[PDB]
Amino acid sequence: KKSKLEIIQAILEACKSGSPKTRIMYGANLSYALTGRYIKMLMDLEIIRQEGKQYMLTKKGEELLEDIRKFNEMRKNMDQLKEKINSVLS
Amino acid sequence: KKSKLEIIQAILEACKSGSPKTRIMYGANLSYALTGRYIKMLMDLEIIRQEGKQYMLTKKGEELLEDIRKFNEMRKNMDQLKEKINSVLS
């Protein structure tokens, strides 16, 4: 099960190069109805924008996606360092 | 209440420049008996060593303390980035 942040990241990743609603739906593993609710939320915050049937990232959305990717990389490195620490103590 | 890792860090920080048992006890906020148990554990793992009445870090212990400090800094930066992300989404 994806967390709220993982759902948002999936939506932004799809919108990075432009994406229709159905692609966003399957990418975030959401019902069609829930996909609409997330899209509306992100559009209201001006994180994504719409061009015809496609959804794309705004500059704000691009920066947000970058921050999320950076956050996930930090988590990965932290988890690995924790394994290093634990190996020394056990 | 300190976590196990916070207790260990407090002990290593005290041992960095050499420390008697009582100083370690108050630094880690442990009973005298528990302080002895942690000291024995770290000595068995060769993380700390004893010179007279003083306890000091071994090279292994120095590296461990550095890893813990790095880990805590990573956590701080991660928490701050999470605040940045949350501010954009709310």
What domains appear along chain B, each with residue ranges and CATH number?
A: 1-90 (1.10.10.10)
Residue type, A17: S
DSSP A17-77: T-B-HHHHHHHHT--HHHHHHHHHHHHHTTSEEEETTEEEE-HHHHHHHHHHHHHHHHHHH
Elucidation technique:
X-ray
Search chain B and give the residue with CA nearest A77. B74
Burial B50-80 (b: 16+ CB within 10 A, else e): eeeeebbbbeebeebbeebeebeebeeebee
Instruction: Please judge whether B88 and A67 are an interchain contact, meaning their C-beta atoms are less than 8 angstroms apart.
Output: yes
Non-local (6+) Cβ contacts of A41 within 8 A are none
Q: Which two tokens stand for residue A13?
A: 């990743």
Sign of CA dihedral B57, B61, B63, B68: negative
Instruction: Please judge whether B88 and A5 are an interchain contact, meaning their C-beta atoms are less than 8 angstroms apart.
Output: no
Gap between the Cα atoms of A68 and A50, Å rounded? 22
CA A25, A47, A77: angle at the middle one, nearest 5?
80
Query: Structure resolution in Å?
Result: 1.5
Rounded to a whole number of angstroms, the distance from the CA of A1 to the nearest CA of chain B is 20
Residue B89: which of A45, A70, A89 has the nearest Cβ? Answer: A45
